[PDB]
């Protein structure tokens, strides 16, 4: 009941046909849930691709980032928001039959999403280049993979709060996030009868996201209170637990495995400088100042490897989950940077 | 067999007598495990008290911080290292009988340790003031409590990587650490057959410490490899899991409960500025730059409320567990700050 058009729509389900996956299995049919905002011009020069992030859907990207006086303005651009494979709206553990059902769903990599999106854009939209690819966190992982895998296709790229190659510390964080779910016996090796049977694991998952998803300064200065939650307990229970409670464990695990392995250097034998050296897009690297796990240092290290790129950190004590749109001043910064990027040749 | 003289000694067990605890229970006899390094001078004016930190013992403070070339030099100072109530050496769930055994052990607060330490110093050693109180993390919590509770007694205070009133974020971290242990079915509500039976909970606890105890920069720049571990997997297994593996779950929960509730403002009805304003000790507030949960910003906000004090962050990408002595640059900075502190004129 969570993954519906009534909650996340409108979107279109587009069957892009069979999808051979990097890990070796083939999806007989890959359905991508796509939301399109704005019209494509005759040059097809105004398309923007927006990948979705961990546990997220196209509806979040639309609610937080897209609109009239925003950088992502559908009166000027054709903004194409594409849901991750495994996110519950596109083909996922939760909505696919046969051998891909539930814990049978394949291991999907960032590169598989980008490959599917490329097929979608060329064959269903007839688009041969993107004015901008922009995403946050896992959405930034896909942004980097686009810029490296199809370098002449991507004219501009904005990687918000995410890296091109995942760190060992981030891998550990996600492993602990996974174990929060899989160590709940009600998970039943993915064969749980309903999402909510795994409430304990989903709550433990939410508590870890509270610990790592914001920042110590967020809580010290009472940001949670400004958002309407009088205490850490109220914030954990009223915001964080409630966010994850209706979601599907198998889907979260599909996206967590994928997030763990984001690595554009797979194109270059593990040489990251060589992969990032391939980027032709005008690229803004935009970590959030207080992000606890995609750090300013992590992202600056990569930016130095991307030719013609710019380092444009967002200042927000809301840290990583400032992506959720809790900090309007952060959103204003982001809009100014993105408008400047879109304005550049 | 982890909590022995063979592993953590030499130390002496001193019975300081009954200890009425803040939470309301009375310990009929409180034994403190104490290690002394160096001799007291003629008027006992060279005593330095070193409390121990979460999961730690006096052995760690000795190995990492005490020695002739160092600020805590036993050829000049009498350095008295006192093990936390609950840490397995002093009176704890793992070694106390009667109604205090195992799951029955009382909820002990930072203030109970400081009161017990004060009784130890005055009644057993005849010491009536301290040249320095210094500790890290939970050791820093006890340091602040000392400086607030007995302000004339403490001539100098050095609070490394810890705060005077615990934050909500830190409380959540420790709650998650506690649940890593208590959700292991083998924990059996504190009635586990042995430490070893609760290995799954202890390993999850270790993984959480790996996540929060160092820093992303520590790993990004390959510090774990410099320390001799080929990969994150080898570091987690060979350093972090191994550290917690032999420890007692009930003792860790005692120290965790205590850590969660460190709060010197209990002396002043919740008014932290009033509590910290009581401090007369020359005080250095020394967060570790890349500490993920006792942040530079957390400690700065408290330092601003302590009169006479100085803010001296330790620069280390090793973050919180740089307390374990992994970062020799950080130890060198600390020695320099502590030597400067110890040279402040006696009033």
Swiss-Prot record, chain B:
Q: Work out whether the entry's keyword set contains Hydrolase.
A: yes
Q: What's the Enzyme Commission number for this chain?
A: 3.1.1.113
Task: Give the AB hydrolase-1 domain ranges.
Answer: 65-298
One term of GO molecular function:
acyltransferase activity, transferring groups other than amino-acyl groups
Any one GO biological process: biosynthetic process
Q: Which UniProt keywords apply?
A: Hydrolase
What is catalysed by this protein?
A: ethyl acetate + H2O = ethanol + acetate + H(+)
Which residues carry out catalysis? 137, 291, 320
Highest taxon listed in the record's lineage: Bacteria
Q: What class of enzyme is it?
A: hydrolase
* Effect of gene knockout: Inactivation of the gene abolishes growth on 2-butanone and 2-hexanol. Mutant accumulates ethyl acetate.
Q: Which Pfam families match?
A: Abhydrolase_1
Q: Which family does it belong to?
A: Belongs to the AB hydrolase superfamily. Acetyl esterase family.
In the UniProt entry, what is the domain comment? The 3D structure excludes the ability of the enzyme to bind homoserine and acetyl-CoA, indicating that it cannot function as a homoserine acetyltransferase.
What is the role of the protein in this entry? Esterase that catalyzes the hydrolysis of ethyl acetate. Involved in the degradation of short chain methyl ketones (MEK) such as 2-butanone and 2-hexanone. In vitro, can also hydrolyze vinyl acetate, 4-nitrophenyl acetate, methyl acetate, propyl acetate, benzyl acetate and methyl propionate. The highest activities are obtained with acetic acid esters, but the alcohol group also plays an important role, as compounds with two carbon atoms in the alcohol moiety, i.e., vinyl and ethyl acetate, are by far the preferred substrates.
Oligomeric state and interaction partners are given as: Homodimer.
What protein name applies here?
Ethyl acetate hydrolase
Q: Supply the source organism for this entry.
A: Pseudomonas veronii
Name the gene.
mekB
């Amino acid at each position: 009941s969570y993954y519906t058009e009534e909650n996340h729509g409108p979107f279109e389900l587009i069957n892009i046909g069979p999808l051979p996956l990097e890990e070796g299995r083939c999806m007989p049919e890959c359905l991508l849930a796509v939301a399109v905002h704005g019209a494509l011009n005759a040059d097809k020069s105004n398309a923007i691709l927006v990948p979705t992030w961990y546990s997220g859907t196209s509806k979040a990207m639309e609610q937080i980032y897209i609109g009239e006086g925003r950088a992502l303005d559908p009166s000027k651009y054709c903004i194409i928001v594409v849901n991750q494979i495994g996110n519950g709206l596109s083909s996922s553990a939760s909505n696919t039959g046969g051998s891909l059902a539930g814990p049978g769903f394949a291991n999907v990599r960032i590169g598989d999403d980008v490959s599917a999106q490329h097929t979608l854009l060329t064959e269903y939209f007839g688009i041969e280049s993107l004015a901008l690819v922009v995403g946050g966190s896992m959405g930034a992982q896909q942004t980097y993979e686009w810029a490296v895998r199809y370098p002449d296709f991507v004219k501009r790229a904005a990687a918000i709060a995410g890296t091109a190659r995942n760190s060992e510390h981030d891998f550990l964080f996600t492993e602990i996030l996974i174990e929060a779910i899989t160590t709940d016996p009600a998970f039943q090796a993915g064969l749980y009868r309903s999402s909510s049977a795994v409430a304990a694991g989903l709550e433990r998952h939410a508590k870890l996201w509270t610990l790592m998803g914001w920042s110590p300064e967020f809580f010290r200065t009472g940001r949670h209170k400004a958002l309407g939650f009088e205490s850490m307990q109220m914030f954990v229970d009223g915001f964080m637990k409630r966010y994850f409670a209706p979601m599907d464990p198998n889907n979260l695990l599909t996206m967590a495995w994928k997030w763990q392995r984001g690595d554009v250097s797979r194109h270059t034998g593990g040489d990251l400088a060589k992969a990032l050296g391939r980027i032709k897009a005008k690229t803004y690297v935009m970590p959030i100042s207080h992000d606890q796990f995609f750090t300013v240092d992590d992202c600056l290290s990569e930016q130095k490897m991307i030719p013609n790129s710019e380092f444009r950190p967002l200042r927000s004590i809301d840290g990583h989950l400032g992506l959720f749109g809790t900090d309007a001043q952060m959103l204003d910064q982001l809009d100014a940077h993105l408008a400047e990027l879109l304005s550049s040749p």
